[PDB]
């Protein structure tokens, strides 16, 4: 029989102006099925109102079992990243973080390691306190380390 592929659909949460090209490398690995971004002009239209942004986030997260935060230098302070993490967690979805400063951006090279966005918050499910999982790729050749382990990392978050 012809072999098939089955990839988990995910929502990527990240700081665009610093990390969009690093996240592209993860898309290129072909391991997860993340939604592609809307165009810049479409994003500007969405951003005209807070309700529009929330509608877009809520709709994009709806059919996703896992939110994947790609952690760069400023991700922890992005207000819509906070909203996305909160929405995914409140909706019972998996939440996981991956540091991406060791992915080499064609423009900015290697990045500054940023704070863990999740550490600013206390997460609970059913009165248990949980810390979302965060993975730190190998300092040298982070691309290959991520590619080899990303699918498992997301399944670990799903089972949490
Ligand atoms: N186009 C998109 O899909 C898009 C863009 C930005 C943010 N977001 C959502 O908001 C969250 C927070 O991100 P943020 O804090 O960077 O938001 P933000 O609203 O602060 O980002 C605005 C910036 O996004 C850039 N941008 C928009 N569309 C882009 C694209 N297609 N490719 C490259 N750059 C693009 C613009 O340069 C702009 O400066 C993200 O996790 C994501 O869910 C989505």
Offer a few descriptive terms.
five-stranded parallel sheet, globular, Rossmann fold, two-stranded antiparallel ribbon, 5 helices, 160 residues, alpha/beta, binds nicotinamide-adenine-dinucleotide
Give the ligands present.
Answer: nicotinamide-adenine-dinucleotide
Tell me the CATH architecture. 3-Layer(aba) Sandwich
CATH superfamily: Hypothetical protein MTH538
Number of strands: 7
Quaternary structure classification = monomer
As a percent range, the share of helical residues equals 25-40%
SSE order, one letter for each helix or strand: EHEHHEHEEEEH
The N- and C-terminal alpha carbons lie at a distance of 34 Å
Rg over CA atoms, rounded to whole Å, is: 15 Å
Count of separate DSSP helical elements? 5
PDB class: hydrolase
Keywords: NAD Hydrolase, anti-phage, hydrolase
Assembly: monomeric
Entry title: Crystal structure of EcThsB
Question: What do these coordinates show?
Answer:
Helix 1 links the parallel strand 1 (9-13) and strand 2 (33-34). Strands 2-1-3-4-7 form a five-stranded parallel beta sheet. A two-stranded antiparallel sheet has the order 5-6. It has helices at residues 16-28, 40-46, 50-61, 79-90, 142-159, and strands at 9-13, 33-34, 66-71, 94-99, 123-125, 128-130, 133-135. Helix 3 (50-61) packs across helix 4. With 160 residues, it is an alpha/beta fold. Nicotinamide-adenine-dinucleotide is lined by residues 13-17, 20, 37-40, 43, 47, 78, 80-81, 84.
Concise account of the structure shown:
With 160 residues, the protein is an alpha/beta fold. It has helices at residues 16-28, 40-46, 50-61, 79-90, 142-159, and strands spanning 9-13, 33-34, 66-71, 94-99, 123-125, 128-130, 133-135.
